[PDB]
Amino acid sequence: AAAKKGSEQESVKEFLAKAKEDFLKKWESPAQNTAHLDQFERIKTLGTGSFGRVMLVKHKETGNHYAMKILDKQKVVKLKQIEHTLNEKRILQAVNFPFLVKLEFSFKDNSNLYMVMEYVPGGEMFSHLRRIGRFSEPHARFYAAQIVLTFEYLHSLDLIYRDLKPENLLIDQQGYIQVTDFGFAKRVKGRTWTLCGTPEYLAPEIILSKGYNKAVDWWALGVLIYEMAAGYPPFFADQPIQIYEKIVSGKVRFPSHFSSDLKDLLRNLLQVDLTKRFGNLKNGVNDIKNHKWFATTDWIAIYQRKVEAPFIPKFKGPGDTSNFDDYEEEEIRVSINEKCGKEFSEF
Amino acid sequence: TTYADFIASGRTGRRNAIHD
Ligand SMILES: O=S(=O)(NCCNC/C=C/c1ccc(Br)cc1)c1cccc2cnccc12
């Protein structure tokens, strides 16, 4: 089944060729400077990172709500994330898939870069997962199927995503996944070397400074599925170094409640040996799609959003943020002097 | 239990990406 090249495979191939045509046009001529800060009313912070924050905003002219990522150019420079930030915007403006958050506008001012994306009101998978404890296998399977199709899409465009984790997956009003955080996404044919990601999710080849490819995203998928079904990651400790020792050791233990199909899938994803890792073999993504654990999954129905979600987030009208944690707010200051102009000229 | 060890650990909150 995993090797068989049936008519279904040709349909996927057909779809992906058209998707690549659309992507390359936007890749080669990126949208730039498509809004201004004063067009948006800033409401509330939805998340924070090392070099900025994401805030709920309201677009004045339409009344639509969006999630606006505000990046401090000076902080980006100090953390040596200039190229990664250029990658993030150039890639996100060019992609189009039902499980990828849309970038609606982007622009910059003297101080900051801005990416205005669709607001996804159901909150982070992380929040729901921690609160509930763990997801059932059918629940985790539903989410995992979306990541599988999303990685099939991204990878066909020569993109590596490199930051899969529940914190970067939002749940929409239909209970479907929206992948956010393209900060480490990169278009690369062949090999790359940057040590980036999140410790619990890093493939062993990343931590061992080997040079790596899209197979790191499949390993990260193994970590995500494990964490969703177990309630904890397959490699955890109090400090990152300790996590890395676990990751490289080649040993993984599964909760006693894991189905034997689930265990088998995870052994093939959390496979240190690249000649053996699912997603990285002659059959590519089909080794995953045709695994026993996914027997009940109808891939076309998932793509079409026809499958009933295992839960719908509580929705209390537009602009409601009760699915998100509260963060300290800080006034956006725009310097009277342009910072780091040369470095971000293409943004 | 592994779950109890996880809940008692310092990494059950949001995990930051590593840059440098
Ligand atoms: O609030 S988020 O940021 N949650 C997803 C990632 N977890 C929070 C991390 C935020 C963050 C902000 C700035 C940097 Br620099 C790094 C991380 C977030 C990001 C992008 C789009 C969103 C759409 N709707 C709701 C939230 C959205």
Side-chain angles (χ1 to χ4, degrees):
Chain A
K4 318 212 166 318
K5 294 191 179 192
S7 61
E8 184 169 349
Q9 267 83 5
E10 273 322 303
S11 289
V12 172
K13 218 154 85 188
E14 219 182 349
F15 173 91
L16 292 176
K18 168 69 145 40
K20 201 173 178 107
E21 297 178 302
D22 296 352
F23 166 87
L24 286 173
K25 274 168 198 177
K26 293 182 180 176
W27 170 257
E28 293 295 340
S29 335
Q32 183 163 16
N33 190 41
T34 56
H36 186 280
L37 179 69
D38 293 350
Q39 288 171 342
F40 302 93
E41 165 191 337
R42 301 189 290 279
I43 300 167
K44 200 176 184 300
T45 297
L46 304 169
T48 59
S50 302
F51 41 78
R53 62 180 61 240
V54 169
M55 304 189 70
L56 178 64
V57 301
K58 194 180 87 177
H59 189 232
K60 289 167 182 178
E61 301 76 6
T62 59
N64 289 315
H65 295 271
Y66 295 108
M68 182 170 81
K69 189 154 164 185
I70 306 158
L71 303 193
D72 179 325
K73 285 186 275 179
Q74 295 181 317
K75 292 181 178 170
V76 174
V77 168
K78 280 170 187 174
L79 286 164
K80 306 172 194 169
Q81 298 297 307
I82 295 164
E83 194 77 20
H84 285 162
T85 291
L86 294 181
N87 287 344
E88 175 175 20
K89 176 263 169 165
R90 188 187 176 179
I91 293 164
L92 197 53
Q93 66 83 41
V95 298
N96 171 30
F97 203 63
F99 316 128
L100 292 178
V101 77
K102 296 203 175 297
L103 179 64
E104 300 286 332
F105 308 100
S106 74
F107 54 91
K108 66 203 176 187
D109 62 21
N110 280 347
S111 285
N112 303 311
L113 309 167
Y114 304 87
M115 288 172 285
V116 179
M117 296 163 278
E118 14 166 33
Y119 173 50
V120 183
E124 300 166 3
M125 182 188 296
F126 168 86
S127 295
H128 298 285
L129 182 54
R130 289 291 180 274
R131 170 166 176 194
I132 303 165
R134 66 179 165 95
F135 298 150
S136 66
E137 293 187 27
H139 195 160
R141 174 188 295 124
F142 172 77
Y143 294 147
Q146 294 165 67
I147 304 306
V148 170
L149 295 171
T150 302
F151 287 173
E152 183 177 19
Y153 172 84
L154 293 176
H155 293 177
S156 75
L157 306 176
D158 311 299
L159 301 163
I160 304 172
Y161 172 67
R162 297 196 295 191
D163 206 16
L164 188 71
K165 58 185 172 188
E167 295 92 311
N168 295 349
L169 306 173
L170 280 44
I171 315 296
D172 68 25
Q173 251 305 282
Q174 278 93 284
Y176 277 76
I177 284 320
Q178 295 268 300
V179 181
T180 64
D181 285 272
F182 273 59
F184 300 141
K186 186 178 188 184
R187 195 162 182 239
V188 215
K189 292 174 184 137
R191 217 184 300 172
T192 199
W193 303 265
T194 308
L195 166 58
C196 58
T198 301
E200 283 88 341
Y201 284 74
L202 298 182
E205 64 266 25
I206 299 182
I207 106 124
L208 296 173
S209 305
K210 274 193 69 228
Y212 60 88
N213 61 15
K214 68 190 72 185
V216 306
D217 280 338
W218 295 123
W219 170 284
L221 173 70
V223 181
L224 180 70
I225 297 167
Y226 185 116
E227 185 175 331
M228 295 189 291
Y232 50 88
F235 318 100
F236 70 86
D238 286 331
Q239 298 303 320
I241 174 68
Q242 304 179 298
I243 301 172
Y244 305 147
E245 295 188 44
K246 290 188 185 191
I247 290 160
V248 299
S249 84
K251 306 194 272 153
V252 186
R253 301 186 52 86
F254 303 107
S256 61
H257 66 77
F258 270 28
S259 66
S260 62
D261 284 346
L262 174 56
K263 289 183 276 178
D264 180 79
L265 177 58
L266 299 174
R267 294 177 224 275
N268 289 113
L269 288 167
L270 298 178
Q271 168 59 261
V272 179
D273 181 2
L274 283 62
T275 70
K276 300 188 185 161
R277 186 179 313 152
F278 268 23
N280 204 41
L281 312 181
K282 159 191 67 83
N283 301 338
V285 68
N286 300 316
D287 283 339
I288 296 158
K289 294 209 216 172
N290 291 118
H291 191 278
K292 293 317 282 191
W293 198 70
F294 286 113
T296 52
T297 305
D298 181 342
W299 297 98
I300 302 87
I302 292 288
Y303 170 83
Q304 291 180 319
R305 302 179 153 251
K306 276 165 179 166
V307 174
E308 189 196 10
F311 101 102
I312 300 279
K314 304 297 188 202
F315 166 90
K316 306 156 182 193
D320 166 42
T321 71
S322 60
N323 296 311
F324 297 83
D325 282 317
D326 303 312
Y327 289 86
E328 184 132 26
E329 304 292 355
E330 196 198 47
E331 197 51 66
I332 307 306
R333 195 188 154 268
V334 182
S335 176
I336 58 148
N337 300 292
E338 197 192 54
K339 317 294 184 180
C340 313
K342 201 67 214 291
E343 291 93 331
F344 299 100
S345 50
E346 84 167 39
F347 191 99
Chain B
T1 70
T2 315
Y3 162 84
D5 291 335
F6 178 67
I7 294 307
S9 78
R11 297 184 67 88
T12 66
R14 279 184 185 81
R15 303 155 288 196
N16 307 138
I18 47 151
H19 302 290
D20 135 79

